[PDB]
Amino acid sequence: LNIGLQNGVLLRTVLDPVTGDLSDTRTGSRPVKLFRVRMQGQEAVLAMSSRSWLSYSYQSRFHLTPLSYETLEFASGFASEQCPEGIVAISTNTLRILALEKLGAVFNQVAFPLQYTPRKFVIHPESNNLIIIETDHNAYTEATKAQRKQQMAEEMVEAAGELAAEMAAAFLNENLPESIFGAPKAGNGQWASVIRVMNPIQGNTLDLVQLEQNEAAFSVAVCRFSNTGEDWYVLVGVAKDLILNPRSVAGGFVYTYKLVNNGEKLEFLHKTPVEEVPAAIAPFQGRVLIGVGKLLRVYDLGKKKLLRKCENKHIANYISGIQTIGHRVIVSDVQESFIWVRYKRNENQLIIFADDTYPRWVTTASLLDYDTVAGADKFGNICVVRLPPNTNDEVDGLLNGASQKAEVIMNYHVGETVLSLQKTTLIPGGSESLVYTTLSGGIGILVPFTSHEDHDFFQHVEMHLRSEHPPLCGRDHLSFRSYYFPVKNVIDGDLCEQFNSMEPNKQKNVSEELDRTPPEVSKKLEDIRTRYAF
């Protein structure tokens, strides 16, 4: 049975001579009316309060997913030859015969095409547009491609043969859409990049800039230098003649652009050469930090070319990303780890004060708060590293690293390269969580427990499930999660949420091992997902 109130909330319950069990969510402050349709091989329910919520036990699991469409007054099931399965829905002064797409795939989407591999993109906070830098090793920028095409046509004619038969202009007219016929592209050291300002609502590219041939773009930032006014500026790192596998460059440059027209037009200011590939840029107390090669510079904007206001050259290997909380700065280099760094302002120094004790090929990082950083890794792990409590923020060796090191308080082998970690809240009013996405396409979240009771409970669920429902391929789940560094302080949600699919007798074995009943246990699983996430 399903119960809909008029303040948007809703209840489930299983039916017996009595109502036995319950669990309830919200569905909008407008009265919640329930309707019946059969869908994708199952009957399931609609419900509208302020948007339409399709609920279906997705192969024996309640998923209650909103739709992407306007509010409703009434509806009901419908089938036709024109629309083999769908909905009659009467709506704001309207009647609609609808059809519902793939009944999996938690997420919607809409796609806007690009040209190259998009390496990075930042949001202009006033206008809310995206600045994307795209790149491609082993490719051709548009100029060079058109030039080389027509040029090959020129050496076609020289065949001196019947001169008459001219495929030249035919060829030169022919352009097969690269998106479908492959990228007519090659070379070993030849990069090609592009910058694009793009509106996020509609796909239109508000603006575009095409760098030279052997220029690649590697990092971008959108800042507002303190000395000048409220003008926003765009800085785009750029490497010049990268060779990948041996490794050597000609050098770097740092394009600077003015971001005019309320946020819809890039226009050049000046490009300042620099002595290696500036691989990451960040705004910081009105001036811009730029990690180039192994050195870390504080730059400030002059009207001729960027100027150097400070520097540090101790950073170990090569700087891959840099993060800054208000005062201090987490450099993150490619091999060694996170390296903390303090910016003594009046005395104008950058001082290395504490850093991690492991080697860890960081790809991306993110700041949880003053003390702690959460960092992905390129082999597949996720680590979370916090400075120990008593450290001295401000100083001026030990184990060849800095004086005081940073403890590690969570290790976990996600499974796939994690390329972008970020802390936020998905549902409105649902508690902060840590969302990661990966390089295979998965999107997961990590979620902090609040109460030792629940933490110990989930621990025991998974510990028993581990042994009473081992993975298919024979791997041992504890080892798998402890591939590179041993697991520490994480409970696996996809082991635990497999209970619901075990076989009932074994369900019972476990359920009694905790002395609960399968429904009790299952509901207690469905909380964390229900309340933190989708």
Partner: peptide, 25 residues
């Protein structure tokens, strides 16, 4: 049983908050 009561209260907290937010909505 106390733990049961407790999580009942937890859920009541959740519903109250989300519905009062809808109320401002």
């Amino acid at each position: 049983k106390k733990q049961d009561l407790d999580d009942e209260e937890k859920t009541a907290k959740f519903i109250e908050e989300q519905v009062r937010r809808g109320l401002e909505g």
